[PDB]
Design a protein around this nucleic acid. Structure first.
Ligand code: MG
Ligand code: MG
Ligand code: MG
Ligand code: MG
Ligand code: MG
Ligand code: MG
Ligand code: MG
Ligand code: MG
Ligand code: MG
Ligand code: MG
Ligand code: MG
Ligand code: MG
Ligand code: MG
Ligand code: MG
Ligand code: MG
Ligand code: MG
Ligand code: MG
Ligand code: MG
Ligand code: MG
Ligand code: MG
Ligand code: MG
Ligand code: MG
Ligand code: MG
Ligand code: MG
Ligand code: MG
Ligand code: MG
Ligand code: MG
Ligand code: MG
Ligand code: MG
Ligand code: MG
Ligand code: MG
Ligand code: MG
Ligand code: MG
Ligand code: ZN
Lengths: 49, 116, 144, 111, 154, 53, 101
RNA sequence: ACCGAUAGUGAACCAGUACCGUGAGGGAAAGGUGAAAAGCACCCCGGAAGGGGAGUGAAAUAGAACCUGAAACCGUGUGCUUACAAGUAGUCAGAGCCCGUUAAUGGGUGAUGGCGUGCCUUUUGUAGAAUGAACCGGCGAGUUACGAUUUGAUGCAAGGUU
RNA sequence: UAACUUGGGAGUCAGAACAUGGGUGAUAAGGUCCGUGUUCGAAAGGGAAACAGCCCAGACCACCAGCUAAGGUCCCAAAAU
RNA sequence: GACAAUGGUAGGAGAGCGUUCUAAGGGCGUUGAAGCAUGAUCGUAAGGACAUGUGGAGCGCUUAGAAGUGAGAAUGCCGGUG
């Protein structure tokens, strides 16, 4: 293989999902958190258990 | 590495403004209100492509009614007669015939009347 | 393929008609006249242009109502001043201003658009049997 | 043939300057001079000096005949604004725009 | 970040009554000159793979060279003094491409110094062989002793 | 009271339709030929009504 | 003389030498196409199909296989963060009518 | 595989300065002529400012916070249009007039007709007379570290791995 | 033509009207609380003047083609004076 | 070739566009780069070219890598201007 023709193994890599970057993505605005409540808050959510 | 805002923003906004060319005042000038109007324009155009078929069929029908009345026949009875005669010329063609050559339309009217 | 004919001022021909109101029912005469004024009887009818014909209505004073409309059909108007309602019965209006009676009945059957107003301007109503438009050479028109 | 003169950063608001420019736009040079002399506005003398400078370089730089010249163009563009403040009641300050004008006069012989 | 930017301690104006948006520090992220939200922070990007996979990678790069015919075995480099021009001539006589990786059994001072200034020529030892160098090179020029040593190691 | 909506350029310029000044009321001085205000002394020559002022 | 032809789920009134635009036909530019569904023949001699005039044909030459002007189909539903933008160019065939019958 | 003048230090510049506070203390804005200063002799209008020539220069349309020079916003001219009309300002249809392009079943304008109560947020439900935004520009929000788990990938395999 | 099991990721826990079976209220409420269905929510298009929740009907895109639904056919305004 | 599906909020899944930087390869540029402006251009979308003017020295393209990667709203911050 050549440094100008590198190719990872099929299925080894997947682009990470970025939230809060517009409506078309489906994760804009509330960024997958839904609306309001404790679980919608930065640092929100109860202790495990 | 840092990615500064750069040129993409201006390029995108300018595209929207150019699409807003011709609009009144601020609506062809300011990106926010131009964007809003271009959205409304898209929605209106989608709706009106469908409404236009309705509109032109309505026009054709009105003209056919006027021609039939000139031949002492109602639009409704003329369409029933043409159907029973097996003639499939559509409203747009019927209107254009009625406008352009009255004798052809008169022969069609007689075909309808015979069928009835 | 787009092929629908569109009338325009270069190819529109407006004729003049005379219609006799005597012994005719107000609303029925009115609807027909409105059709004529809008040009709905022409095969070149085109919605965005005036393809209609001119109409003279004679003998407006001899128009007739059914039922008790003569005393019970009331025309109301408002002067845009507080308490400024004024009314006139259809019979009284026929006695005192039949031209307005016919005009208003017909114009209520035309659209409230710039074109509608223009088309309604092609109506001429006269209470008697004479009209001043012999120069326009109008033809008698039979209703229905 | 055309001659131009510009007075840049005159400390008069462009709205005000343009009130007077609207009087002389498109007129003959002598009539314009008279209008400017007999018009009682702050910008009239400044505009008059611009017009006379334009006539002067028409004659000197381009050997144009000054008695046949017309004010072909006259306009005021916005110069940079001096930002000032006025103390108002209750410790507040409110802005003051001391606006300036770039005044252009162009005269032409029409040929 | 907002903690790191200088100043910012006080509330810039009272919570209520002034008509302004509420603010807690002039160094908040939406303020010009404010602290940065997240951003780069010093860290390493290095990671490890299993040793068998490292060895497999080295073998795969060498095998790719051998199958592409970019493998040339030389008897030895008999350089007594460094001479870039002699080494350039040696490359030319061997008819090598622009990018050459030269492999010696052990550190060969004079070969390294002679090849050092030639663009596209890299010199390494059998122990120092690595995937980036092998892959970057268009041809490998390896001495016989180096080739045997590499064979032993891998 | 305050403006409920800002004033468009169109509306402002319509309002300014009549905001302007006029050419002064001036005529040529019969003495020196320079323009003067009617019924005023001519400042160029100081003449009025065929006499010096 | 004119004819009513049926093509691309539509009907078109055509005269000889007229240029017409229709739904994409399966033909090459330069070829001759034959419309075999003639509903009506007008002019000097009138023929009324019921529905089609038997044996009547209209021949034409294929001038172009084009794509119509771009339409931007855009829709949205306010307050729902929901919109859709698509492009469209409708294929068409341009022909010139050579002969009726 | 750090920033590149709203970034990077608060501070690229005479900055812990100016400025604010009794004080402890708080705390900015502000970079770019040109290769060379060759930084516009001289003439002209003007008190000056400013300008028009002339000249230097590849360029002054590089002339002093002098590379580039977007938008808001302010002007001048003009092709089409508008003083009987009820307008979320467009859209679909459409004469007339004026043009002539990345040459495409072109471009600008728009008599007149149909349809049509912004956007965001928040709501059972918002044209809403609920919230937010004067406009324009820039800046402005799921990141990284270390653990856990799961999935994909790869090596080796009763072994795998430091 | 689904159904179930195991595992990764969620959101939701303010609901509304209409019809109908009921409690409460006064066989009051666009009231309130349950049962059943539909629609809205998250649904544009046609009708009901306008009118989330009613009636018809579920928009992949284009067409100046045809048949129908509810509802309509004197004129506004398509179709029976 | 056939014929089946393709309204949609919270939300799940997938495929992509564009920005800066890096590596390798291959290219452009004072016979004029980026940027800016204009245009009747191309693609199913994000978006991509071409021409001309301005500008005056840097910048694409391909494959892969990495992120301070995309704004219209926060009575958001700063500047400019209504
Ligand atoms: Mg997801
Ligand atoms: Mg994805
Ligand atoms: Mg969704
Ligand atoms: Mg979620
Ligand atoms: Mg929220
Ligand atoms: Mg909630
Ligand atoms: Mg929740
Ligand atoms: Mg930005
Ligand atoms: Mg339909
Ligand atoms: Mg306020
Ligand atoms: Mg900073
Ligand atoms: Mg950088
Ligand atoms: Mg800059
Ligand atoms: Mg600072
Ligand atoms: Mg600084
Ligand atoms: Mg500059
Ligand atoms: Mg008028
Ligand atoms: Mg939004
Ligand atoms: Mg509420
Ligand atoms: Mg509001
Ligand atoms: Mg609130
Ligand atoms: Mg407000
Ligand atoms: Mg802004
Ligand atoms: Mg209730
Ligand atoms: Mg309740
Ligand atoms: Mg229920
Ligand atoms: Mg809801
Ligand atoms: Mg609905
Ligand atoms: Mg309706
Ligand atoms: Mg569907
Ligand atoms: Mg009708
Ligand atoms: Mg769908
Ligand atoms: Mg960002
Ligand atoms: Zn005098």
């Amino acid at each position: 293989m050549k440094l100008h023709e590198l190719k990872p193994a099929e299925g080894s890599r997947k682009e990470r999902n970025r939230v809060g970057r517009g409506v078309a993505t489906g994760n804009g605005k509330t960024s997958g958190r839904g609306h309001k409540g404790q679980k919608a808050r930065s640092g929100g959510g109860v202790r495990p258990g | 590495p840092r990615v500064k805002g750069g040129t993409v923003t201006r390029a995108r906004r300018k595209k929207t403004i150019k699409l807003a060319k011709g609009y009144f005042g601020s609506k062809h000038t300011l990106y926010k209100v131009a964007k809003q109007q271009v959205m409304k324009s898209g929605q209106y155009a989608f709706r009106d492509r469908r409404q236009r078929k309705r509109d032109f069929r309505k026009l054709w029908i009105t003209r056919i009614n006027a021609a039939a009345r000139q031949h002492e026949m109602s639009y409704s009875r003329l369409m029933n007669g043409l159907k029973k005669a097996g003639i499939d010329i559509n409203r747009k063609m019927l209107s254009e015939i009625a406008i352009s050559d009255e004798k052809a339309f008169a022969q069609l009217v007689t075909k309808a009347k015979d069928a009835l | 393929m787009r092929q629908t004919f569109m009338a325009n001022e270069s190819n529109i021909e407006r004729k003049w008609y005379v219609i006799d109101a005597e012994g005719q029912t107000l609303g029925r005469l009115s609807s027909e006249v409105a059709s004529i004024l809008r040009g709905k009887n022409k095969v070149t009818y085109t919605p965005h242009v005036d393809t209609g014909d001119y109409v003279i209505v004679i003998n407006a004073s001899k128009i007739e109502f059914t039922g008790n409309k003569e005393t019970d059909k009331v025309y109301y108007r408002h002067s845009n001043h507080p308490g400024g309602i004024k009314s006139i019965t259809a019979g009284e209006l026929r006695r005192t201003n039949p031209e307005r009676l016919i005009e208003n009945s017909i114009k209520g059957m035309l659209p409230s658009t710039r074109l509608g107003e223009k088309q309604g301007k092609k109506l001429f109503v006269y209470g008697g049997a004479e009209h001043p438009h012999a120069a326009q050479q109008p033809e008698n028109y039979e209703l229905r | 043939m055309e001659a131009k003169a510009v007075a840049r950063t005159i400390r008069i608001a462009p709205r005000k300057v343009r009130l007077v420019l609207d009087l002389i736009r498109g007129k003959n040079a002598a009539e314009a001079i008279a209008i400017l002399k007999l018009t009682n506005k702050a910008s009239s003398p400044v505009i008059e000096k611009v017009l006379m400078s334009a006539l002067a370089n028409a004659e000197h730089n381009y050997d144009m005949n000054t008695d046949e010249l017309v004010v072909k163009e006259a306009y005021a563009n916005e110069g940079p604004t001096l930002k000032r403040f006025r103390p108002r009641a209750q410790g507040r300050a409110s802005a003051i725009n001391k606006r300036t004008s770039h005044i252009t006069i162009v005269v032409s012989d029409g040929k | 970040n907002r903690s790191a930017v200088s100043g910012g301690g006080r509330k810039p104006w009272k919570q209520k009554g002034t008509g302004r948006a509420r603010q807690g520090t002039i160094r908040a992220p939406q303020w010009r000159g404010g602290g940065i939200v997240f951003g780069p922070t010093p860290r390493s990007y290095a990671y490890k793979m299993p040793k068998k996979m490292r060895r497999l990678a080295l073998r795969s790069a060498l095998s790719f060279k051998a199958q592409e015919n970019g493998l040339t075995v030389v008897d030895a480099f008999n350089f007594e003094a460094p001479k870039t021009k002699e080494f350039k001539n040696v490359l030319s006589t061997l008819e090598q491409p622009k990018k050459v990786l030269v492999v010696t059994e052990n550190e060969d001072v004079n070969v390294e110094l002679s090849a050092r200034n030639i663009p596209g020529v890299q010199v390494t030892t059998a122990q120092g062989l690595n995937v980036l160098d092998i892959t970057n090179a268009d041809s490998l020029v390896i001495t016989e002793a180096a080739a045997k040593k590499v064979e032993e190691v891998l | 009271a305050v403006p409920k909506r800002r004033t468009s350029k169109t509306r402002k310029n319509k309002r300014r339709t009549h905001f302007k000044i006029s050419v002064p009321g001036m005529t040529e001085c019969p003495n020196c030929g320079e323009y003067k205000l009617s019924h005023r002394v001519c400042k160029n020559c100081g003449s009025y009504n065929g006499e010096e002022v | 003389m004119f004819a009513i032809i049926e093509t691309g789920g539509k009907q078109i009134k055509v005269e000889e030498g007229q240029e017409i635009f229709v739904e994409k036909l399966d033909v090459n530019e330069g070829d001759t196409f034959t419309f075999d569904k003639v509903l009506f023949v007008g002019g000097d001699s009138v023929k009324v199909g019921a529905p089609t005039v038997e044996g009547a044909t209209v021949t034409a030459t294929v001038n172009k296989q084009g794509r119509g002007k771009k339409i931007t189909v855009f829709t949205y539903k306010r307050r729902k963060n929901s919109k859709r933008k698509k492009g469209h160019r409708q294929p068409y065939t341009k022909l010139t009518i050579d002969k009726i019958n």
